[model samples]
Target chain A: PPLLPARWSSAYVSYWSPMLPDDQLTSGYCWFDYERDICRIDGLFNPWSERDTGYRLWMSEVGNAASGRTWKQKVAYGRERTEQLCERPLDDETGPFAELFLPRDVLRRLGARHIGRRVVLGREADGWRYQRPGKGPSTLYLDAASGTPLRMVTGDEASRASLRDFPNVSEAEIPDAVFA
Target chain B: EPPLLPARWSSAYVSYWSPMLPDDQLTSGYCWFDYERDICRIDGLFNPWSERDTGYRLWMSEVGNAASGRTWKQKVAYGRERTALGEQLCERPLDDETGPFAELFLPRDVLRRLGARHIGRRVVLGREADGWRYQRPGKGPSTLYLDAASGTPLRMVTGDEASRASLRDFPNVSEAEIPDAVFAAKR
Candidate 1:
């Protein structure tokens, strides 16, 4: 099967990333309305340990990052929202929560192949790997049924993401504040 | 601060430069634009091969009448009207592709009336774009950029660039279908 599910319905994903500076960890919730081409991520990276890094990102397919339609609202711990230009644009490859982990697009880009099958992240997963020219092969494990990424490893870095299903989320049901 | 041309008009012919398409001979044209309804009919526009009538009519997206001239009838592909949650502007639904580029139709002094400031200028796509910043009470500053040569909008960071967005159906959903608030400032 392909890395992506036939269609990604609306859902919320709870994810954690340890790729922060000084090996710090950041946990966040990602709201995906893939059917509507809208996504948002709210992250609080363990408070203001070294920097005020709590951030909220809202992305829509509004012209694209080239036209500066991408909006980012970053707020520090105990601070008001700071609006700024986003360094990254919303895309399938970047996904909603690129900081959390590599999305399925990465695997699709490298032309991943099924290596084997095993259990990962407490679910039955299909193992996939892709070999770089003259370099070691990167690997990923995804839920066999839903195509959700359970874990992925590339070089010295790796990340994991788990999903929670929320069925039939209408566009009106989405919080108005999400876009604000 | 530069000698600017009409960004948009209501049932009038206007001429100006297009920085994006420098050599196009059809820069000047007649446009019957209904900004509030987010619909427009623009004729005399150029696309290299021939002149075409293109705008959002019978469809909420750009409909270029690219059919051959020999036939009296024309064929056009359908475009789904975007009805997503993001279409809401201050709780008002704008179900068209023209919302983001709405400011391209306003006058220069419209920014002044809205209490905006000319912050600075920046180069966008190798062309000079003037930036104007506006602030709503307790809200983040919204910025808008206009192409220096032609007054057409280059980009806008915030949705509310001028007046009370809520009063005009969030974006001036016209009384006569030709917003007086928008055209009055064209001096």
Candidate 2:
């Protein structure tokens, strides 16, 4: 029989960033939903390291303006729900201005089976630039269905080091591998 | 005063009776001033569901009357009908002292008469949930004239309770009350 479609599918992508003195990088993943023809994106970061602060997630339609006019509607969520974790600009469409965070409970809900897959990731800045020492790479994840980033870059190097010491290194590496 | 009704009574109040009223039953009608079209198109209700057919028939009737040089009293009556239906009225017409801007409390009989004359006209107004101002015809915009004290219709400022108490103001005239020939002619 043909390969059975996975109940849920995800892809990961890594990018090399020359910005930091170290081989700084960023990564992301996309979760796909074939039935709805949409995807969600999530970024990953260390919780304890100075480089890692938090993550961001968003829903995107097939041809959205932010998705490079790709006929999607990209909508941001979890910013307000995770205000204390990661601070980023509120989505232009709907904003009271909020931050983004992915709690451990929510991560586990995405299911352990699909957590550590290689997924396509994109950079926040259009073209990468160079940075001085101490700065580290950033990582993101995307929903396989709608291709929206599920996580966003939050803090700097110190945060990433702290995050690496957490018991769930597999979840932490999910985002780090995107840019590795 | 009776309990003040919220703009969206459905969400705010729990009642045995639903606030939803068909367009035909509504005492008033409304329309927005469609600037691009240069005419006041029908808009949604301040308190919707009271009148049927929304405010479309009333709006077209008033415009027809104004174009035909109807009597000022008739125009005023039509204007009230339009406002009650939620049509956006132009302030410019009222700007001129001699122009058609006049306000009056419409008795139920007058309202019924207006309804009888105009029914099933095309309505152009859109629906709105909450707001004081309405769009107007041949004008950029218009402001609603609310009674400062009660924030209800200025003419109906006495409130529905007081109006109900004065039901005698509109005697319920049956067909028998009129002469035989008059009823025949009306039929």
Candidate 3:
């Protein structure tokens, strides 16, 4: 007998050229559910300045938020460097995460991450693989413990510029309105 | 000089013959004598015989130079007239009072003698006699003959009907000399 119908899955982070203002930078993670033919995209806040106050997370759907660690975890530790900035957990039912579907220009000024890095999800023989930018061609295995990013395989060159801009900040700062 | 005549002579009279002969034969170099004048004209060669009653003289020689650049020189003589043997016939005479009339059957030769050089050319036939007369092909009637029967005057055969009748009377007769009225019927 041939192989049984297999459930397919894949995820990756890739750099996206965001339509944000010149002062902002951004990246994204994308996961593909082959069985459902659905691609989930998450916009992660990366700014030109290292001031953690401006960092934020936005998503198009509630299911995408549930699949990730709490929005609080995502905004602080979602990217390569886990630096906490906001204490508010994204309300599972209603929050800025649901506003990800807003027009790209509006999202850009709202401190929403510009479309930069993206994660691609695809089905494989063994299981789902998570690929990040600058990672070796080989796919990193998804940690069985949590279905989220396990290691910081890719680094953000734009984040380095932001960090250099605000050297005094240790913990990332959230823009005052981001939490409001 | 006298007009050239064969040793055997018959009669001299004017005749109407079409398809006249060329100048060389009748006019250019030939000698013609005028009996009335009695004086031989130096260029009598050019003196042409007039057609019967028409008073129009067929030229002895065509005037002007020849076009072919060839010398216009030839002996003056009548060329034989061509005719079909059975085609010739006799016709009714002009009047009952006249002696039964007859005509000569000369096709083209008659015109040649009168110095006519072209074929089918028209010329008067004979003099009038009591309003009628006859003529041979080339000769004109200087003297009208009388009908021996009632002494009725006669006339010349001027057209084909008279000519055919004359032709039939003298079947195979190459040349005929008869009174002009032999060709006509009295009205």
lDDT tens digits, residue span A1-180, model 1: 474432232212121222232322222233443333444543322223423333222222111222224344332212122322112212322213222123335566778889889765345778778765476666676678767655544432233222221211122233333433
Q: For candidate 3, lDDT tens digit of each residue in A22-107?
A: 33222222233323222233333333233454433433222222233223223121122232112122433433333222111221
Off by more than 4 A, model 1: A6-22, A45-69, A78-105, A130-138, A152-180, B1-187
* Interface CA RMSD of each prediction in angstroms: 21.4, 32.0, 72.0
Which stretches in model 3 have alpha-carbon errors above 4 Å? A1-11, A14-29, A42-54, A58-84, A94-180, B1-187
Q: Could you give the CAPRI-style class of model 2?
A: incorrect
Candidate 1 residue-pair clash tally = 0
Report the Cα lDDT for residue B140, model 3: 46
Candidate 2's TM-score reads 0.16
Question: What TM-score would every model get versus the actual structure?
Answer: 0.29, 0.16, 0.16
Candidate 2 Cα deviation (angstroms), residue A7: 8.2
- On residues B1-45, what C-alpha lDDT tens digit does candidate 3 reach at each position? 112122111111112222222321111111112222221111111
Predictions in order: chain A TM-score: 0.47, 0.24, 0.25
